[PDB]
Amino acid sequence: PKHGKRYRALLEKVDPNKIYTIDEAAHLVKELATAKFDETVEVHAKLGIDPRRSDQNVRGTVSLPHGLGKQVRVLAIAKGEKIKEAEEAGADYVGGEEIIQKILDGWMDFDAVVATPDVMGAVGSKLGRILGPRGLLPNPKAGTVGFNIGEIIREIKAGRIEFRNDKTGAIHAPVGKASFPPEKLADNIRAFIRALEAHKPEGAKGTFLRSVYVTTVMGPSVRINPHS
């Protein structure tokens, strides 16, 4: 069949006609985590926007109240003293334009890139075609470009996530782990939804949150009332 026995059992646990409250889903989603690791919990929403126009894009970051339950390998590219501000903030890999060469050669061992605006000329032109397609190019809207490198790094290390609608008008984010207590999952989920709504495009017509789902890495989805 299309799914293995493990996944089939999980499918029994969901009412496919029910719209769950966030509180309920918080509990349920933990039951939907039966893979052989501590599964990330995810939220997905179908947005009432035209992804074809940039002025109706939804893109930002939100600090999850309870963090991500995952460490983020952070590479910072900075010039001068900012190089130390970076290291001190806890950056995994630190460097200036010199390390651009490493990435040009194929080095990709990191999850997030942050940089001072003053290296963004080189980063953009040298790394743009490498980091861009990977959604790893530092960017104001992603909160990954700034002179306050240490504050950015700390926010990211503290559980700040980025979200950006895809070309189909959908949007997705990790919001914790199946090991989180349900109340904490619930908080993180709301935090994300709130951040989403704070980025509703003025021009967006009709229901913004057309649908909102919660799920686990390897499990089925649960449809939720975003305002619960």
Next chain:
RNA sequence: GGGAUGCGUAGGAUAGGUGGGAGCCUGUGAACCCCCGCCUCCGGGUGGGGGGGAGGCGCCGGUGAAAUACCACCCUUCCC
């Protein structure tokens, strides 16, 4: 309501987008072989019947603008 889509070059090859992902499937039957429906760019994709009887997939690496298992929300175009 149900199901599949998606093929420049390179790449094992028909790579839809994004997000998750370090695991996934498998005596509730792997590889492999035969047959069939639908689709087909004639490569295959996808679903199923029969045989078979324990391995298969991903990661890694490689190619690439992008990387594949698995899962989720969607898109396009299509079927029932």
